[PDB]
Design a protein around this nucleic acid. Structure first.
Ligand SMILES: [Zn+2]
Ligand SMILES: [Zn+2]
Lengths: 82, 148, 93, 99, 110, 88, 83, 99, 109, 95
DNA sequence: TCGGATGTATATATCTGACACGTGCCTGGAGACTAGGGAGTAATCCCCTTGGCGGTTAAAACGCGGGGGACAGCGCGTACGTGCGTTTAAGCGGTGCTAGAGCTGTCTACGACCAATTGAGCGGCCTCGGCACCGGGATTCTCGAT
DNA sequence: ATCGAGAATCCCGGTGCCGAGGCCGCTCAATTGGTCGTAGACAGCTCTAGCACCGCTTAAACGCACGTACGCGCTGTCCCCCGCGTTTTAACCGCCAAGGGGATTACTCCCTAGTCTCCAGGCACGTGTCAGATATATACATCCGAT
């Protein structure tokens, strides 16, 4: 079992993701919030990925499952299949 | 685990309160297999007749309905060959708060007036809704030669 | 003339089942027709994409069930899945 | 003597350095652990194809980068240069994600 | 269910099952349409319609009208937390919007 | 006051209102009886035949299905019944 | 039968009403023009599709189903007119 | 003597009055003329079903109402109560319409 | 053009026309697939591929690299207008992002 | 045993490349991206033509269906050029 | 706090047309039967996923000094809301014409289906060059100090 | 304004490696040819609904005056992010090992397509009546100036 791993999305990693987005100055209350929204996004993709894996009666979540989940949500991904 | 207490409550009900013009009981030692006896109501073409019927309590009683079926051969629009019955509170309208007494009174009310809306045997339904004299003639003959 | 198909009578049946007195306007009946057709298209399309992904060639019940788990949000999903499983179990036996 | 740039220049230099590249920014193993945790929450006893973890990471990074672009637009709109949580909340509320 | 009546009745539903079966066949969704799928899909459709009609009827009773009109449908859909998420992009005709004023715009308590 | 142990039971399975739930139709039944009469029935009230589907969703979304204050009255007035009901 | 400057038919009071329904308390005098612009663009992305359906079925009347399909194509499904 | 409400109250009253109703706000014939003009621009010599014009009007009104909701959110975010064109432009840029 | 030859070459394309025909038949897109549809579709796909490869090859020549990589595909897609409108939602793996610093954040005298 | 075969548009994309840039290669990840792009565009166009042939109660995906799906699915200049290329290829094939 | 003044909700007759219901029929849904192939079950096999060291070292965590931006406060001059008298054209009803959507009938050329057959394309092998990388050197922004 | 020290960034050359592009063998699906049922094209007829016009009412648009609330700019404060040096935690990598479960092949059977026959569920159509819209006249709530 695992617990408290959203803290693995550290502060400087969010700073990097912010720089690439074009953000010059960040406020200390962003980091926490960011983790929050990121988690939501994952809890919306993995849930569908699993739903595909559970349909085909498999136990591994292949890349095509994640790609289909994304495409179903509207975040089409190019580079792993599809 | 709750089915045992539910059937206990039902048998205590039939003990302290006999159904209207009816009676019931466990045909065997097992609580899920039962036999009941219905008397022919006056406002029904089967006056005076007595009919025995078998009850099969399900595994998820009360939330699942218990299948009842008339063992005696009856020429009824709602009774097929073996004696199954078409009742809505027995298939989908079944509310698990109902007791035995309520389903017995409902089948009594159906005996008072057959419901050929969704019938099991078509020709008896059509002769009941076409010419009622031949219908109650044959039903009275049946309830005198098989229920007596 | 020509005869068209619609879910009007069935929507009215469900209405008179869950609200024995309130009727329903005509435009609301049109909106319900459109809603039923839309949800039909969504569920059927997702089940078809499932059948095509798993290389099957038939839309069984479980494909519709997985499509319902995908489209509808959480609690609607659970309730509708239970309702459909119940309907199929009753239809079989 | 200790030569230090004024606050506001290393930020722009980092912006350029990170927009001029493509590699992943969130480290691999912590993101993999987070994904496996959410997984065991949804349906227990799962396995993952490494390609699936990588696809998840790419999607998450692209989503966060888009969100930070729109957040920065909001913060500039409010006559600021710092992003604050109300900026992110406004971006997500307008974008149509949560409403 | 041994009843050899219309499949709608044999499933206990109200929506047609034969019609859904045909629409699933003639619709080019797949080559074969199992005999269980139309029943399941008709049940799901009936359940969703029941939800929406119940909520709309509640709203119409609230507005003291005995006949659901599109405004009541919009109210029912937008006030629920899941039916709104399922119909986030849909636009009900003649539906109006949810009555709400932003808190900052309300007058200053003086 | 509180109704006696007789009426404190579930109106369906004749057993104590273990973790009761108060439906919009003012009725009440124990949590297992509830979950059964919703996951294996027509989502309606077992007492007055009233659909509670939307209410059910709205309240289980918040995990506010169980009626806490009635349950506290049951656990302070008849705790031993709830404990003997706790095993089965 | 040509026509001109019909977008000025979307008057200033109509846009003020649309903004009130949206929950806007005070509108700047430079919104109106801007709004019209936006509005026009929206139409030039729906009608273009609607007509494209009409051209395909070899008809000369843009039917309600054409407009509804054109809308559904953009992700703005519209209930109440069919389909 | 001439009783006049302070500026800011008739606005809220109108907000309530218009959110409490459903009828169309853009008058019919001018919108119909605009639609026919754009049509003759795209493919000449067209005819329109009245239902199609009504559907166009409903879609346009719903779109504009959504856009004004998000614009008002922006204008409030910038510590204002007036909507200005930069608010609409930001709403459309974030929403993902024009980029 | 009359011929007895692979439908691709006969049509004057590079994409397969037989494979596209099979995908249009066995994909449940419709009951019957006209004999002239797969040719049209293969032509359109070939045109789009040629467009993106033109732009990506240019962008790769800019970086002095003689071999397209995902970064160059992303650049060629975002810089163009119609292509960026067509792939608005698509995410190109390992694609980076356009260099874009907002003007207000830049230094000032 | 023997591994099953997986179809892809690799060689065709490579042919088109060597037509456009006769000296510029392409890396495997870029090839996968182009392949997925071709698949996605094929799916969009085909599904749109399918809905379009189902709206008018037709049962055949003619070339006209693909042409109208292209007109509906692509921006202005791309739509025009792609329709031109398609018509050219179809008439060359049939003649 | 406060009494006018105005917009709003409320109770009451009334009247009309939209909705709910009954009917004929007819077309589509249900029932019986046959065949065949799609899917399920079993077996196997080897690809790759989890798990685990252990070493290096890039990267995160922490603390500190400060300076620049967030934010509050004042002010002021304009843009905009409110109200009103006036002018415009929308809305409605009614009428007349016909263009074109829609439906039926006939006939054939197009696509499905099936047996053969043969080469394009895919899997596997492999090798030389493009790109990665490191080290140094050239230069170019940046900051302070005048 | 300027110029000079200090980091940072861009160019350039040598070395190296692994993967991109090409070759070869072979299976299987794309092609060819023939047959056949029917979807669809086309002519013809119908008649529904869209277009054009007109006249009248009155609601809404409009142009204007005016007072004022607030949008915008300025100032001042202070506190909280930034840059940076230092230390500590853990990612990453290269390696090895076990085994599980994804993928594949063979067989069998039962579930669904296809066909024919038959009949009632539902649909277009017609009809009556009350739910709701309308108009009128009230009570009531809320705003605002002035105490
Ligand atoms: Zn109970
Ligand atoms: Zn109740």
């Amino acid at each position: 079992v695992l617990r408290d791993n959203i803290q693995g999305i550290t502060k400087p990693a969010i700073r990097r993701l912010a720089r690439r987005g074009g953000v010059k100055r960040i406020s200390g209350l962003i980091y926490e919030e960011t983790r929050g929204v990121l988690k939501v996004f994952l809890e919306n993709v993995i849930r569908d990925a699993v739903t595909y894996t559970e349909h085909a009666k498999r136990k591994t979540v292949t890349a095509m499952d994640v790609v289909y989940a994304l495409k179903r949500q509207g975040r089409t991904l190019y580079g792993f299949g599809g | 685990g709750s089915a045992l207490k539910r059937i206990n409550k039902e048998l205590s009900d039939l003990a302290r309160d006999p159904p209207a013009q009816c009676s019931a009981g466990p045909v065997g030692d097992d609580m899920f297999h039962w036999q009941a006896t219905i008397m022919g109501p006056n406002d029904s073409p089967y006056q005076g007749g007595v009919f025995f019927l078998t009850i099969h309590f399900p595994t998820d009683y009360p939330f699942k309905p218990p299948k009842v079926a008339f063992t005696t051969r009856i020429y009824h629009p709602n009774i097929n060959s073996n004696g199954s019955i078409c009742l809505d509170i027995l298939r989908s309208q079944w509310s698990p708060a109902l007791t035995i007494s309520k389903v017995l009174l409902s089948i009594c009310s159906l005996l008072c007036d057959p419901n050929p809306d969704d019938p099991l045997v078509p020709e008896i339904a059509r002769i009941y809704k076409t010419d009622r004299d031949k219908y109650n003639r044959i039903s009275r003959e049946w309830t005198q030669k098989y229920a007596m | 003339r020509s005869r068209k198909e619609s879910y009007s009578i069935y929507v009215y049946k469900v209405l008179k089942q869950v609200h024995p007195d309130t009727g329903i306007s005509s435009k609301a009946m049109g909106i319900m027709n459109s809603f039923v057709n839309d949800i039909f298209e969504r569920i059927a399309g997702e089940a078809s994409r499932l059948a095509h992904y798993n290389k099957r060639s038939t839309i069984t019940s479980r494909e519709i069930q997985t499509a319902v788990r995908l489209l509808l949000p959480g609690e609607l999903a659970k309730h509708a899945v239970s309702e459909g499983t119940k309907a199929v179990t009753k239809y079989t036996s | 003597k200790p030569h230090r740039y004024r606050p506001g220049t290393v930020a722009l230099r980092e912006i350029r350095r990170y927009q001029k590249s493509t590699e992943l920014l969130i480290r691999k193993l912590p993101f993999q652990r987070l994904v496996r945790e959410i997984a065991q929450d949804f349906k227990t006893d799962l396995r993952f194809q490494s390609s699936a973890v990588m696809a998840l990471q790419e999607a998450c990074e692209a989503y966060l980068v888009g969100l930070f672009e729109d957040t920065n637009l909001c913060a500039i709109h409010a006559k600021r240069v710092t992003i604050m949580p109300k900026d992110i909340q406004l971006a997500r509320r307008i974008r149509g994600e949560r409403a | 269910s041994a009843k050899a009546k219309t499949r709608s009745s044999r499933a206990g539903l109200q929506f047609p099952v034969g019609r859904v079966h045909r629409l699933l066949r003639k619709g080019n969704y797949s080559e074969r349409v199992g005999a269980g799928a139309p029943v399941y899909l008709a049940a799901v459709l009936e359940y969703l319609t029941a939800e929406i009609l119940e909520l709309a009827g509640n709203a119409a009773r609230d507005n003291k009208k005995t006949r659901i009109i599109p405004r009541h449908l919009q109210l029912a859909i937008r006030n629920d937390e899941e039916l709104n998420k399922l119909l986030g992009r849909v636009t009900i005709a003649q539906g109006g919007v949810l009555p709400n004023i932003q808190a900052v715009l309300l007058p200053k308590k003086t | 006051a509180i109704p006696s142990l007789s009426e404190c039971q579930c109106g369906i399975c004749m057993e104590i209102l273990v973790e009761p739930v108060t439906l919009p139709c003012n009725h009440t039944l124990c949590k297992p009886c509830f979950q059964s009469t919703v996951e294996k029935a027509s989502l309606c009230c077992p007492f007055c035949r009233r659909r509670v589907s939307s209410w059910t969703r709205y309240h289980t979304r918040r995990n506010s299905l169980v009626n806490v204050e009635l349950w506290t009255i049951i656990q302070k007035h008849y705790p031993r019944e709830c404990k003997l009901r706790a095993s089965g």
